[PDB]
Structures are given as C-alpha cells and as structure tokens.
C-alpha cells in the first residue's frame, strides 16, 4: 500500500486532482491503520517532502500536515529530522513554507531544540542581502510570532521583537508583507502590542512631517526612488487596524489619533495644487518625472482609502466625520476619472474598476449596510448626504467587487481576517443581502449583478460544505429557496 | 579618564584584562546606563572630547582590547559609531585578529556612513594580504547595506578583472 501511494502521488503530478486525492486518502488511512510502519512512513515522506524543490509539493505538505495532526508525536519519535528539515527551506516559498510551518507548529511548541535551530537559521535568513527569497524568512517569522503562545518565558519575545525591525529598512515588496501580517500576531500579546505600536509610530513619523496649514504632510518623494522602497497605503491600513485592536483590547495612542486626525484634516485642507500633481498634463508613462508622479498618484489615492475606513469607526453617526469622509472621497475620484492611474488607454477595467482597494471586508460590509438598508432616526443625515454622492455609491460597492474577485480567483484576500474562511463566510452572508435588495429597489444596479454572480460562483467552488449555512442565512430545502 | 569615570559612575566598571565588564548582561540595562553616563559626564563638548580620548586610550590598551573580544554599548551609540569605525580601521593593520574583527562586523547594524566604510574596506583589501583581502571581500554581502550596492558591484567586477589571483 505504501509503495502504491508513493507511485500514486507522483503519478498525480481533473484526473490529476482525483489521483492526488486518492493517494492522500490512502496514505492517511494506512497511517491511521498500519501502526508499525508509522515511523518508516513518516521518514519516507519527509525524504520525499523535500524532494521536489522546483516542482510544486502542495499535496506533499497537505498530506504531511494531515498525518502530523493525526499523530502529533510521530515526528517526535522521528527525531533528528526537526533540525534537518531546514536544509533549503528558504529557496521556493509558494506558500509551501507557511504550510510546513503550520503543520509542524505543535512540534515546535513542544520541541525546544527545533525552536533553537530555527532561531539559528533566522539570523542567516533575515540577513540575506538579496531579496529573491528573503520574503519567505520574514513570512515564517511572522507566522512563528503567533505560533508561540503569549501566556503571561517573556524574555523570548523581548528578544525576538527587534529581529524583524532590524530588517525594516528593506525593499518595498519585502516591506509589504510585515504590514499585512503584523495584525495577526497583535491579538496574542499586550506588551508586544505596545512595542509594535511604538515601532510603527517611529516608522510613520519617519514620513509624517508635522506642520499646521501647509503642504501635504506625506513626503511622497521619499519612496519615489525609479522603483519604490516604502509602500504607504498598506502601512496606513496596518496602522488603523492595530489602533482599532489596541483600543478594543483596553502617549503613542494619543500621538496616533492626533496624527491620524491631523493628516485627515490636512488632506481636506489641501488639493491637487498642494500636492506635487497640480496639472493634468504633468506626468506621462515611461517618463522619469511621469513614473514618479505615477507612483505618487498610486500612493495618495491609496492613502485616501485608509483614512476613509478609520473615520467611519470614529464617526459613529457623526456628521462632521462624514463630512470629512465625503470630502475625502472628492479628492480620491479627482485623481481618478480624468487622470485615473495615469490615463490607461486600454479599455480595460483593472480590479473591477479601480486598483487594489485597501478596505477591511468587515468595514465595506458595514458601510453598505449603513449606505443601503441603514434607515433610522439615529442617523444624523450623514448617510443621506453620503447617498447624495452618486460617485460614492459607485465606489462603495466597486471595492467589494474587486474584493470578491480576489477571493474568486485566489483562496485568500487582503485585509484583516481575509484568509480566515469562517470569518469571511459570515461576511459573505451579510454582504449579499444589500446587493440583492438594492437591485430589487428599482448604472449602479449593474454593479450588483456582477457582485451576486461572483458571490455564488465563489461559495459553490470554495464553501462546498458550508452551503447549508448560507442557504439558512440566505433568508434541507436547498432546491426550494434556490428556485425562489 | 572621562570615559572611565563615566563608565564607573554608570554602566560598566573598569574591567582589567579579558574579565567581563561589571555591568548587567543585557542590551537594555547596560546600554541605557552607558547612554545615561554619556549624557551626564561627557555632555560638555570638551568633556565629550576627553571621554573620546579616554575610550581611545582604553581601546589601545591590550587589556580592554581582549575584553572587547561598555565597549559594545558605546559602539551602539550613534555618536560612537564613527568612533568605533575609526578605532576598527586603526586596529586593522596593527591587529585571527582581522578574522575576529570581520566576524564582529558580520551581521552588524547601521553605522554612521553608508558609502564610506565600504571604500575603507576595499582600500584595506587592496593593501592587505591574500587571506585578509579575501576575508574582507567575503564580508561584502554583509557590508552591502544597499547604500552603495551597484557602484561597489562594478568596482568589484573591475577588481576581479584585475584580480585573477583572488577571483574566487
């Protein structure tokens, strides 16, 4: 049986998917059945697991994770391999490293030698001058930060805090992933949250440029040079998410809100003339000044999205915050429409209609519920004036349409809890109602037709076992309501 | 010495020989105490110069030279970074001492110069013998802080063209 499965897994490389599923199932069954070959099977698959560096090994990591979660102590009896498994781990991260780490995580949390060896490898990984594979190292370290418990030795954390910060001055693509991944580990500790917030405060103050009634505070020229090395929209989104979590869990936080409030106030008390991009005929593609302005344009409207999200949480039925929100969007589309991106004569609509958004799925879910079906005397007409902004209506759902398309093709998506399916599934349940109802209200409705058509195609292809929950939330009579 | 007086007042007492400095063994307490001492005693520019001279005299002493293998906290200071670099450059030709210095510089943090220490290392490799030059050059990935990546790469390619005896 084990020889058959070893042949099967390679034969899988549709029919290939069925063969891989069959091989994995028979290996899991024989591991759960054939007790005396458990150690030999584990050693053989570990030898095979690190056997296809160039070829995809996703099925390998899946089967290894299944056998490890079935028998947590199998690899413990398979010792002298926890240290060995890191031979060439930082070569081809295609999410393989993340899966391997997640599968072996119980072993690390019950194996101190493995933790020490990975710490030793961490110095070599993070200090790699090249950027071809340094992303895998930082991704693994970020996952490990949540891998170890935050009960409360704390000296371990106090030591490992500064390791990643030592590599903060890195490439923009490399600097990207820590911003997205810091929120996950921030919900696992209190002192670590303070330290991460302080480090991010230093980073943002590196670009804030405080002043009053003057030029736009964001020193956009810092990341101009040809390429860029300091993304700002992702950093600001991480800032707002970490601030929200820190406030919920319960002066840097006073500095955070003041800086956020000031920059939002600075943005509305500014215009394109205040920014470096004043005239329409200013920047052009394949131009040194053009691409610089092109990067600046890409950054600034990305910033506008983040401040929109933050003020919504702060402005609980607050017209003044809504007035700032609505005015902020007027700057966002001012760059768009006419000088969108640059111009883009290709009759194509990247990201539904706009570039990759920066809004948490919870917020856009809640924004539409406030925007549509959010009728009540509690609101102070802020929704109504928001409803007056017709382009705000179009942009309100257009971001989510890109978001669901991200989940449509890829199995994950940007924003907090994006890769959590059960958290996403609840969000998927709530969003669909307003999209369908808005169409039935009786252009804008044509957007909702795309939004629905993509939401079904996702859950039928992603949440196969979760369909009954959606059908219950749609309001085993599956056919009855579907025909309705 | 002013550096010795500041160290005794706060931080690490004056250790003799290779013995450990009389400070807490941690990057937090020892560095904070050293920074407090440096802000207190050598605060005056003349006192700052006196402390720099005392630290240089201690570094020149073989006892503190063996102790360094405090000094680490002082080098971590932003002002002490150029001083530490100058001390290392001075001790390079005069002293596996160069190998130990290269290893210490390996995985180092941000110094006071992003495009000068690389030039100093290149000059030392040009002047230094075969093994010393090879050790210095092999540290370039650590020394390549992205401050002078491309230019140093071109200069190193030219040296390789002229360096057939040390191409590996």
Swiss-Prot record, chain A:
Monoubiquitinated by FANCL during S phase and upon genotoxic stress. Deubiquitinated by USP1 as cells enter G2/M, or once DNA repair is completed. Monoubiquitination requires the FANCA-FANCB-FANCC-FANCE-FANCF-FANCG-FANCM complex. Ubiquitination is required for binding to chromatin, DNA repair, and normal cell cycle progression. Monoubiquitination is stimulated by DNA-binding. Phosphorylated in response to DNA damage by ATM and/or ATR. Phosphorylation of FANCI promotes ubiquitination of FANCD2, which prevents DNA release from the FANCI-FANCD2 complex. It comes from the Eukaryota. There is a cross-link at residue 124 (Glycyl lysine isopeptide (Lys-Gly) (interchain with G-Cter in ubiquitin)). Homodimer. Part of a FANCI-FANCD2 heterodimeric complex that binds and scans dsDNA for DNA damage. Interacts with FANCL. Interacts with MTMR15/FAN1. Interacts with POLN. Interacts with UBL5; the interaction promotes FANCI homodimerization. Belongs to the Fanconi anemia group I protein family. Plays an essential role in the repair of DNA double-strand breaks by homologous recombination and in the repair of interstrand DNA cross-links (ICLs) by promoting FANCD2 monoubiquitination by FANCL and participating in recruitment to DNA repair sites. The FANCI-FANCD2 complex binds and scans double-stranded DNA (dsDNA) for DNA damage; this complex stalls at DNA junctions between double-stranded DNA and single-stranded DNA. Participates in S phase and G2 phase checkpoint activation upon DNA damage. This is Fanconi anemia group I protein. It comes from Gallus gallus. The lineage of its organism: Eukaryota, Metazoa, Chordata, Craniata, Vertebrata.
Curated annotation (Swiss-Prot), chain B:
Deubiquitinated by USP1 as cells enter G2/M, or once DNA repair is completed. Monoubiquitination prevents DNA release from the FANCI-FANCD2 complex. FANCD2 is only ubiquitinated in the FANCI-FANCD2 complex and the monoubiquitination of FANCD2 is promoted by phosphorylation of FANCI. Phosphorylated in response to various genotoxic stresses by ATM and/or ATR. It is found in: Nucleus. It comes from the Eukaryota. Required for maintenance of chromosomal stability. Promotes accurate and efficient pairing of homologs during meiosis. Involved in the repair of DNA double-strand breaks, both by homologous recombination and single-strand annealing. The FANCI-FANCD2 complex binds and scans double-stranded DNA (dsDNA) for DNA damage; this complex stalls at DNA junctions between double-stranded DNA and single-stranded DNA. May participate in S phase and G2 phase checkpoint activation upon DNA damage. Homodimer; cannot be ubiquitinated and does not bind DNA. Part of a FANCI-FANCD2 heterodimeric complex that binds and scans dsDNA for DNA damage. Interacts directly with FANCE and FANCI. Interacts with USP1 and MEN1. The ubiquitinated form specifically interacts with BRCA1 and BLM. Both the nonubiquitinated and the monoubiquitinated forms interact with BRCA2; this interaction is mediated by phosphorylated FANCG and the complex also includes XCCR3. The ubiquitinated form specifically interacts with MTMR15/FAN1 (via UBZ-type zinc finger), leading to recruit MTMR15/FAN1 to sites of DNA damage. Belongs to the Fanconi anemia protein FANCD2 family. This is Fanconi anemia group D2 protein. It comes from Gallus gallus (Chicken). The lineage of its organism: Eukaryota, Metazoa, Chordata, Craniata, Vertebrata.
């Amino acid at each position: 049986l084990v020889d058959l499965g070893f042949s099967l897994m390679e034969s899988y490389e549709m029919p290939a998917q069925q063969a891989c599923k069959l091989g994995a199932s028979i290996l899991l069954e024989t591991f759960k059945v054939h007790e005396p070959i458990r150690s030999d099977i584990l050693e053989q698959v570990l030898n095979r697991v690190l056997t296809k560096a160039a070829s995809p090994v996703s099925h390998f990591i899946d089967l290894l994770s299944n056998i490890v979660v079935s028998a947590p102590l199998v690899l413990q009896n398979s010792s002298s391999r926890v240290t060995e498994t890191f031979d060439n781990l930082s070569f081809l991260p295609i999410d393989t490293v993340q899966g391997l780490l997640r599968a072996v995580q119980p072993l690390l949390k019950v194996s101190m030698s493995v933790r020490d060896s990975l710490i030793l490898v961490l110095q070599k990984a993070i200090f790699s001058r090249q950027l071809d594979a340094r992303k895998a190292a930082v991704a693994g370290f970020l996952l490990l930060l949540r891998n170890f418990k935050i009960l409360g030795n704390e000296a371990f954390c106090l030591e490992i805090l500064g390791s990643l910060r030592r590599c903060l001055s890195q490439q923009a693509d490399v600097r990207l992933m820590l911003y997205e991944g810091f929120y996950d580990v921030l919900r696992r500790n209190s002192q670590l949250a303070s330290s991460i917030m302080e480090t991010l405060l230093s980073q943002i103050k590196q670009y804030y440029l405080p002043q009053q009634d003057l030029l736009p505070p964001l020193k956009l020229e810092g990341c101009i040079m040809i390429f860029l090395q300091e993304p700002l929209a992702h950093l600001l989104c991480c800032i707002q998410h970490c601030l929200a979590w820190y406030k919920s869990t319960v002066g840097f936080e006073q500095n955070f809100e003041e800086m956020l409030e000031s920059v939002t106030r600075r943005m509305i008390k500014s215009e394109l003339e205040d920014f470096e991009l004043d005239k329409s005929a200013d920047f052009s593609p394949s131009s040194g000044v053009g691409v610089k302005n092109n990067i600046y344009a890409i950054q600034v409207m990305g910033i506008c999205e983040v401040l929109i999200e933050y003020n919504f949480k702060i402005g609980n039925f607050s017209k003044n915050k809504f007035e700032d929100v609505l005015g902020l969007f007027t700057c966002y589309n001012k760059l768009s429409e006419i000088l969108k991106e640059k111009a883009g004569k290709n009759k194509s609509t990247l990201g539904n209609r706009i570039a990759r958004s920066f809004l948490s799925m919870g917020f856009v879910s809640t924004l539409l519920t406030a925007l549509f079906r959010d009728n009540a005397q509690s609101h102070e007409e802020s929704l109504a004036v928001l409803r007056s902004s017709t382009e705000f209506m179009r942009y309100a759902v257009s971001v989510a349409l890109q978001k669901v398309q991200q989940l449509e093709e890829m199995g994950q998506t940007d924003g907090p809890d994006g890769q959590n399916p059960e958290k996403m599934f609840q969000n998927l349940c709530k969003i669909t109602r307003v999209l369908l109802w808005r169409y039935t209200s009786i252009s804008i409705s044509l957007l909702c037709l795309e939004g629905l058509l993509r939401i079904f195609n996702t859950m039928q292809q992603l949440y196969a076992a979760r369909i009954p929950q959606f059908l219950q939330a749609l309001d085993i009579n599956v056919t009855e309501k579907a025909a309705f | 010495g002013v550096f010795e007086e500041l160290l005794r007042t706060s931080g690490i007492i004056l250790k003799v020989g290779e013995g450990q400095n009389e400070i807490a063994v941690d990057q937090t307490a020892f560095q904070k105490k050293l920074r407090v001492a440096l802000e207190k005693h050598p605060s005056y520019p003349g006192v700052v110069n006196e402390f720099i001279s005392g630290l240089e005299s201690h570094i020149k002493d073989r006892s503190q030279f063996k102790n360094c293998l405090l000094i680490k906290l002082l080098l971590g200071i932003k002002i002490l970074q150029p001083a530490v670099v100058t001390l290392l450059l001075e001790k390079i030709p005069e002293f596996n001492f160069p190998r130990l210095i290269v290893n210490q510089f390996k995985w180092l943090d941000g110094l006071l110069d992003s495009q000068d220490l690389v030039k100093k290392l290149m000059q030392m490799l040009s002047v230094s013998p075969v093994p010393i030059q090879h050790d210095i050059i092999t540290s370039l990935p650590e020394i390549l802080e992205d401050s002078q990546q491309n230019e140093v790469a071109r200069e190193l390619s030219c040296l390789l063209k002229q360096g057939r005896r040390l191409t590996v």
